Amino acid sequence: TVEPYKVNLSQDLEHQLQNVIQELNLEIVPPPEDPFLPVVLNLPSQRIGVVPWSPPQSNWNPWTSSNIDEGPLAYATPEQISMDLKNELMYQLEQDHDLQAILQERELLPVKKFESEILEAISQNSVIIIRGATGCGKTTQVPQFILDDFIQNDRAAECNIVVTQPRRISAVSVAERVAYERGEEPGKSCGYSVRFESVLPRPHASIMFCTVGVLLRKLEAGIRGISHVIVDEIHERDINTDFLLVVLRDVVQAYPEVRIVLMSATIDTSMFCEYFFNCPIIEVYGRTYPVQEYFLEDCIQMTHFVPPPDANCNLICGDEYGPETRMSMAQLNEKETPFELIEALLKYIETLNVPGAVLVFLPGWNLIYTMQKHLEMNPHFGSHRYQILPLHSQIPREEQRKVFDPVPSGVTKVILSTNIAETSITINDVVYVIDSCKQKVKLFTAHNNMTNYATVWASKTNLEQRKGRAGRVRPGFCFHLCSRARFERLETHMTPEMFRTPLHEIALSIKLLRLGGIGQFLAKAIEPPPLDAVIEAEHTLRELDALDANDELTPLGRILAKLPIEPRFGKMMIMGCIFYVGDAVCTISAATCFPEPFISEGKRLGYVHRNFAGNRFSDHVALLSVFQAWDDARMGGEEAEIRFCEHKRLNMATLRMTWEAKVQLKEILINSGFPEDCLLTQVFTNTGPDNNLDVVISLLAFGVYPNVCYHKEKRKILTTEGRNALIHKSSVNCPFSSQDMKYPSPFFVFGEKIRTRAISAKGMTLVTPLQLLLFASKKVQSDGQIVLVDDWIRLQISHEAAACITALRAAMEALVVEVTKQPNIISQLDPVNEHMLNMIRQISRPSAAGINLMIDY
Ligand X SMILES: CCn1nc(C(=O)Nc2cccc(NS(C)(=O)=O)c2)cc1C
Residues found near ligand ADP in the complex (CB under 6 A): 109, 134-141, 177, 401, 404, 426, 428
Distance CA 418, CA 453 (A): 14
Q: Is 224 in the site for ligand X (CB under 6 A)?
A: yes
**CA-based nearest residue to 245, from 232, 254, 227, 255:** 232
Q: From Mg ion, ligand ADP, ligand X, none, which one binds at residue 177 (CB under 5 to 8 Å depending on kind)?
A: ligand ADP
Binding at 515: pick from ligand ADP, ligand X, Mg ion, none (beta carbon under 5-8 Å per type) = none
SS3 514: coil
User: Any contact of residue 213 with ligand X (CB under 6 A)?
Assistant: no
Element at 28 (helix H, strand E) = none
Under the binding rule (CB under 5 A), the answer on residue 771 touching Mg ion is no
With contacts defined by CB under 6 A, name the span among 58-66, 243-251, 698-706, 755-763 that binds ligand X: 58-66
Torsion of CA 569, 571, 574, 580, to 10 degrees: -60
Which residues is the chain interrupted after (C–N above 2.5 Å)? 43, 47, 309
Stretch that binds ligand X, among 63-71, 525-533, 578-586, 675-683 (CB under 6 A): 63-71
**Comparing C-alpha atoms, which of 560, 580, 575, 603 is closest to residue 774?**
575
Instruction: Answer yes or no whether residue 192 interacts with ligand X by CB under 6 A.
Output: no
Q: Which residue is nearest to ligand X (CB)?
A: 193
Task: Determine whether 722 is exposed, middle or buried from the number of CB atoms within 10 Å of its CB (0-12, 13-18, 19+).
Answer: exposed
User: Would you count residue 266 as binding Mg ion (CB under 5 A)?
Assistant: no
Q: Using CB under 6 A, which of 60, 63, 457, 748 touches ligand X? A: 63
Instruction: Pick the closer one to ligand X by CB: 150 or 775.
Output: 150
225 binds ligand X (CB under 6 A): yes
Return the ∠ at Cα 76 (arms to 72 and 82), rounded to 5°. Answer: 115
Q: How many residues does the chain have?
A: 857
**Between 209 and 747, whose beta carbon lies closer to ligand X?**
209
Phi, psi at 40, each rounded to 5°: -65, 140
Binding-site partner at residue 135 among ligand ADP, ligand X, Mg ion, none, CB < 5 to 8 Å by type:
ligand ADP
Residues numbered 113 to 172 that lie near ligand X (CB under 6 A) are: 162
Identify whether the C-beta of residue 472 lies closer than 8 Å to the C-beta of residue 428. yes
**H-run or E-run covering 359:** strand 357-361
Binds 62: which of Mg ion, ligand X, ligand ADP, none (CB < 5-8 Å by kind)? ligand X
Chosen from ligand X, ligand ADP, Mg ion, none, partner binding at 223 (C-beta under 5 to 8 Å by type): ligand X
Measured from the CB atom, the residue of 177 and 794 that comes closer to ligand ADP is 177
- Work out whether 198 is an interface residue with ligand X (CB under 6 A): yes
Q: How far is the CB of 425 from ligand ADP (least distance, A)?
A: 6
Closest CA to 504 of 557, 458, 556: 557
Q: Does 419 bind Mg ion (CB under 5 A)?
A: no
Q: Which option in Mg ion, ligand X, ligand ADP, none does residue 109 bind, with CB closer than 5 to 8 A by kind?
A: ligand ADP
Residue 304 near which of Mg ion, ligand ADP, ligand X, none (CB within 5-8 Å, type-dependent): none
In a 3-state reduction of DSSP, which class is residue 257? coil
Q: How far apart are CA 483 and CA 314, in angstroms?
A: 6
Collect all residues with Cβ–Cβ distance below 8 Å to 514 and sequence separation of at least 6.
49
Q: Which does 404 bind (CB under 5 to 8 A by kind): ligand ADP, ligand X, Mg ion, none?
A: ligand ADP
Contact 480, 487 (CB under 8 A): yes
Phi first, then psi: what are they for 841, rounded to 5°?
Answer: -60, -40
The site string for Mg ion over 99-138 (x = CB under 5 A, - otherwise) reads ----------------------------------------
Q: Cα dist. 286→289, 359, 519 in Å?
A: 10, 21, 43
Footprint on residues 134-153 left by Mg ion (CB under 5 A):
139
d(CA 799, CA 788) in angstroms, rounded, equals 11
Q: Which residues contact 746 (CB under 8 A, 6 or more apart)?
A: 5, 710, 711
In angstroms, give the least distance from the CB of 213 to ligand X.
Answer: 10
Question: What single letter denotes the amino acid at residue 588?
Answer: I
Residue closer to Mg ion (CB basis): 139 or 625: 139
Element (H, E) at 395: none
Q: How many residues bind ligand X (CB under 6 A)?
A: 17
Q: Does 218 bind ligand X (CB under 6 A)?
A: yes
If one asks whether residue 223 binds ligand X (CB under 6 A), the answer comes out as: yes
Cβ-based nearer residue to ligand ADP, 175 or 223: 175
Residue 234 or 526 with smaller CB distance to ligand ADP: 234
For ligand X, the closer of residues 21 and 665 by Cβ is: 665
Which C-beta is closer to Mg ion: that of 139 or that of 628?
A: 139
Residue ranges binding Mg ion (CB under 5 A)? 139
Contact residues for ligand X, defined by CB under 6 A: 62-65, 162, 193, 198, 208, 210, 214-215, 218-219, 223-226
